[PDB]
């Protein structure tokens, strides 16, 4: 099954404050339930207690969803925005403390913009030691967070690309050159081919 569910760029550091990028909405197939998503966030890799993140997902039935999440709390979909094949989505998160922050999703194609703020989040605390641009095989569980299943990973195209990637550690821009590269791997085979070049993280389906 799924051995590696994250594909993209992961920076390992400390005191990360902001992560932002713009990404395009691809088309997807593979069945009604197949899915995939693109997002930006802080923590979730070496730091497992929490994740500040936002992005959009895609399903094989042609549907889409823009969302935000403060893991370990369940994610939530945004109501004032639409996601359509080809749209360009500016996404960004800002951690203001280990328990507070905000997420913003802007559809540069439809000019729509949604946002969410977080304060005194008790579920979990950020370590702010990870920053990333990811394409993920995510999961579906019950409200609680148990009985989970990874969703079938939808094939997609064209390659989803994170552009104008920006990260800051205490106000200072951080180099995307130290970033680690991961691939979504299923059954010990890569199903993504992600790569970094300049300020662009590019991932295509394999």
């Amino acid at each position: 099954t799924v051995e590696s569910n994250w594909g993209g760029a992961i920076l390992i550091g400390s005191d990360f404050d902001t992560v932002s990028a713009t990404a395009n909405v691809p088309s997807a197939s593979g069945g009604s339930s197949a899915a995939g998503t693109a997002w930006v966030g802080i923590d979730g890799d070496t730091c497992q207690t929490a994740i500040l993140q936002t992005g959009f997902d895609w399903y094989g039935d042609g549907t889409y969803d823009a969302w935000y999440e403060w893991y370990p709390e369940v994610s939530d979909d945004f109501s004032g925005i639409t996601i359509s094949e080809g749209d360009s989505i500016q996404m960004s998160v800002t951690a203001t403390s280990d328990t507070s922050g905000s997420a913003t999703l802007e559809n540069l194609t439809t000019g729509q913009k949604v946002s969410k703020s977080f304060s005194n989040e008790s579920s979990g605390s950020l370590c702010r030691t990870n920053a990333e641009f990811i394409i993920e095989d995510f999961e579906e569980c019950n409200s609680n967070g148990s009985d989970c299943e990874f969703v079938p990973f939808a094939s997609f195209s064209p390659a989803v690309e994170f552009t104008d990637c920006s990260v800051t550690s205490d106000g200072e821009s951080v180099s995307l050159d130290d970033a680690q590269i991961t691939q979504v791997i299923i059954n010990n085979q890569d199903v993504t081919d992600c790569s970094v070049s300049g300020t662009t993280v590019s991932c295509s389906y394999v």
Binding site: G44, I51, T54, E69, V74, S75, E140, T182
Partner: peptide, 6 residues
Amino acid sequence: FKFFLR
């Protein structure tokens, strides 16, 4: 319900 951890 959707959950985004590595």
